Design a binder for these strands. Structure first.
Lengths: 128, 92, 120, 147
RNA sequence: CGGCCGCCGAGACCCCGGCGCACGGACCGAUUGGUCCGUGAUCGGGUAGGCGGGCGUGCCGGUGGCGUAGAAGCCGGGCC
RNA sequence: CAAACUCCGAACCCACCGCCGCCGUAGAUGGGGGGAGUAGGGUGGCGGUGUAAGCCGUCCACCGAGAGGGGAACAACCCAG
RNA sequence: ACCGAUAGCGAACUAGUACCGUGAGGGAAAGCUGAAAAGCACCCCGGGAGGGGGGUGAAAAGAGCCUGAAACCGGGCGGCGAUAGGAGGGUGCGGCCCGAAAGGAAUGAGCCUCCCCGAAGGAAACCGCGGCGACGCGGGAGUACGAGGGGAGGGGACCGGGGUUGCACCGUCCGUCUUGAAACACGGGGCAGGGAGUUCGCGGCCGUGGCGAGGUUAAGGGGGUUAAGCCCCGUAGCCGCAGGGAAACCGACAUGCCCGCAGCCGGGCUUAUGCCCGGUGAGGGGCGGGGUGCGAAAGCGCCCGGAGUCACGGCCGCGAG
RNA sequence: CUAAGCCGCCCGGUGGAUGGCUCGGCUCGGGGCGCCGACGAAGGGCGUGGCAAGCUGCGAUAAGCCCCG
């Protein structure tokens, strides 16, 4: 249902706008962590983030997951497919799939891919 | 919701092989008899001379990939297609 | 550790077909055979022609959710269906006058499974 | 067919690898003696384990005769003979001899035991026999030749 | 001190939406599984520890490819 | 008057049976196998001991291994998992 | 299916060299221009080193030479900045600033106006009454409103996101032993690379696969191949098929009986699922019988109505660092 | 148009990580080859190049001399 699809897209957008960036504890304190922003579970005996105290950064949990129907979709609503040539481009569904050209593809092949996508009616996320 | 990506004819064998996708958001994987009936009705196939080779569901996707064959005649069916597929499809 | 189930795609397909046929005909024997075949490999049922002869009557349909071995002596005429037959077991069954068939063949012959005896 | 990854790959970030406190898993003291030490002779750290799971670990029992004078008496059963006569037919261990079928068990057995049933009548030639074997053979009608 | 009246106050309790988990069911996968439905007042903190799934790195056997119309690497950003 | 007395004697606890309630064929009670960690606990009520602090047991409620809302801040107290 | 310059031998290089110790002896660091030197002619300045022009080259890659990360230092830009207190952060928003692409968007953004439905929840004006009083009760009314779910009209370029800072509330760092860590308990100037459950032998168990009363080869041999890959053979050996006993030695149910789950069969109820009753019941449990050891015997212990063996992967125990 | 100071981006310096490369290591079933010396060995010292210090090679015939291929 298109109405349910749109409602779940809005729900996912709001949820992921509210979601914070889960980062390792004391990431800001050292360049060795600030230059490599990741999340690591705090495991110390006296770790406040492990204790989940208020006033401290939160931790990832299963509840933050997107609704199943629109999980992983492009914000435009299409499903991204990574394409490396015209043969892979021609296998997409123009009604519900979008093409993302691989970063490694050169200009000579990208021109042909873009032309084929335009004449097939397939959306391209990164047109050159 | 059936979208046929590919249809190819094999005269050396005498069959039409169809690769298609079933788009079923919020619904279970369609049954083999339902898929056969829909495909036969839409493509104007001979129901006693066609089999569904496979239907595959891939993780959290609502699009299942189906491969089916439609032979020219029951003689070709019994000559090429094997016994277990014939029992599964109920054409024997 | 976790039970991975049978690795054989043919056996997995047979289990699915057994469940589907049980649902289609409204009987429990096929589902029972399906889970008995799904039990762990190190505990898979092994039956001997001696036990078949001991507990089988003439003209009876026997289903073994496992392997049938040929240790002993057989005298009855029994239609035995099992996943695997030893060469000696198959020879002895044929000589006694029965049939060594597959579970798919048994289902095709008797879809309702009436009068079939499960043996482990 | 099934292949799995080792538990170390899962324990890569466990900081202990499932050994409990960081003071454990050190050396001989953590095992309370190296090898079979502490079984009870002098140290009794594992005496409680020995008295339950490993009896007669300590002590001596009867003697044993030297292998030079130990003679092995191979045995066979009536059940085995009846089940495997056809194999004996192929191998020549038994044959017909006129009217009554003979089995010369001397080639692979010195004594014949009396386990099982023997239905069809044979005549079996052996060196040693069991009284139950004689009773069963006589009842079934076959003969036991004391070769 | 003996009583009363009204308010304010949690992640507790109630309601809508979403996720996972446990169990059962239908349908579908050529190696552990996948989609969907049903129940959960009687599922959702967690150290030692047990179990399941997934992410990342070097090389080998295959399979499908990209690149001087610019690979790997590096710097700042967008999306999942 | 009695911890090393009892002519008496509770509350209470334990064993067994029937029933109510709850759990159990979506498999309990029970049985077999694989892997552990744990052998310094603390606060609180009760008992012996000590001038007291404390020491030694007992009860399994809370911290240990537990967020959030309060006692001004508090491991243990109240609401609450 | 080894490593790829802190790795691999200590040594990829003028390496067992430089260097340390009287002496036995100990022992490093150190690879890369470019296709071609085409390795910058000439001019201005400087005592020189060099600096600025101008040339070579696809590209300075300029010899202090492939890429040039982080820490650190200097300058430019944006934000704050001399009456303000907490481990340098958390929630929300405001001020200033950036905002081409990869996010949405002229097929319409923030924004403005109007209409419909609506969970849990939920007023008041006013009227009547009770109470010494704070106030309460019936109607208004489950009404106005209410998370969210839909529709229409107007306008025409932002919204999402990012840097800094301000305000309100909250927040005493990280790892570690410990009952107890912010601790006046220990390890904690910064950054980059390196760094810790490995291999064999024996044994217990599990996941799967082959054969099956049998299972499996070891050393080795032949064929073929660029090759050690591939094919066939190889029964010696090991485990199992019979256990009991120190030993001499003796030597057992291919089912006699009962109970009974799943499955099957007959019947009743139930729309169906399903439930109940009665038979048969593999596996399962219990008797009976049997072999052997001790016994004068009775009687007890162990065993007996056929499932084992090999392989791959994993967990664990023991010995080796 | 605030002095020092603080955070972020850009440019430059310092430094030498990453990536790519490899005439070097390591390990191997198989195959080959395995002793030199009083006719003075191995190991060393010292010399030897037009410009020559190190390594390598040579020995007052000294990065070399003669002969068949």
């Amino acid at each position: 249902d298109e109405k349910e699809f749109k409602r779940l897209l809005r729900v996912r957008a709001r949820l992921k706008r509210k979601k914070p960036r889960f980062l390792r504890q004391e990431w800001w304190r050292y360049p060795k962590f600030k230059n490599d922003p990741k999340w690591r579970r705090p495991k110390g005996i006296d770790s406040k983030m492990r204790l989940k105290l208020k006033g401290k950064p939160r931790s990832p949990s299963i509840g933050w997951s997107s609704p199943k129907l629109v999980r992983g979709l492009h914000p435009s609503g299409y499903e991204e497919v990574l394409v490396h040539n015209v043969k892979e481009l021609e296998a997409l569904d123009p009604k519900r799939q979008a093409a993302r050209i691989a970063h490694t593809v050169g200009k000579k092949k990208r021109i042909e891919i873009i032309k084929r996508a335009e004449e097939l009616g397939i959306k391209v996320l990164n047109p050159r | 919701e059936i979208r046929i990506k590919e249809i190819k004819e094999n005269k050396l064998i005498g069959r039409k092989e169809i690769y298609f996708e079933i788009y079923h958001p919020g619904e279970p994987t369609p049954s083999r008899k339902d898929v056969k009936g829909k495909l036969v009705a839409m493509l104007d196939l001979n129901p006693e001379t066609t089999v569904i080779q496979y239907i595959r569901s891939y993780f959290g996707s609502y699009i299942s990939k189906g491969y089916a064959k439609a032979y020219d005649s029951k003689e070709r069916m019994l000559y090429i297609e094997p016994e277990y597929i014939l029992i599964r499809d109920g054409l024997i | 550790m976790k039970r991975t189930g049978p690795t054989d795609p043919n056996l997995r397909r047979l289990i699915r077909y057994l469940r589907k046929k049980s649902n289609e005909y409204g009987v429990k024997i096929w589902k029972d055979v399906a889970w008995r075949l799904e039990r762990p490999r190190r505990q898979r049922a092994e039956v001997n022609v001696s036990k078949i002869n001991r507990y089988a009557n003439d003209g009876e349909m026997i289903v073994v959710p496992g392997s049938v071995l040929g240790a002993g002596k057989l005298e009855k005429k029994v239609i035995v269906a099992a996943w695997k037959f030893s060469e000696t077991a198959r020879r002895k069954i044929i000589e006694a006058g029965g049939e060594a068939i597959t579970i798919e063949e048994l289902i095709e012959r008797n879809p309702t499974g009436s009068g079939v005896r499960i043996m482990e | 067919m099934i292949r799995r990854r080792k538990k170390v790959r899962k324990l890569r970030g466990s900081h202990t690898h499932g050994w409990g406190c960081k003071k454990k898993h050190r050396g001989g003291g953590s095992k309370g003696g190296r090898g079979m030490a502490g079984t009870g002779k002098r140290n009794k750290s594992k005496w409680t384990w020995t008295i339950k799971y490993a009896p007669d670990h300590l002590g001596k029992r009867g003697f044993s005769r030297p292998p030079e004078v130990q003679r092995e008496v191979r045995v066979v059963n009536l059940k085995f003979i009846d089940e495997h006569l056809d194999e004996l037919m192929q191998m020549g261990i038994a044959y017909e001899e006129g009217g009554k079928i003979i089995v010369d068990v001397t080639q692979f057995a010195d004594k014949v035991l009396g386990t099982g049933k023997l239905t069809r009548p044979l005549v079996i030639k052996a060196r040693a026999f069991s009284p139950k074997a004689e009773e069963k053979i006589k009842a079934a009608g076959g003969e036991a030749v004391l070769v």
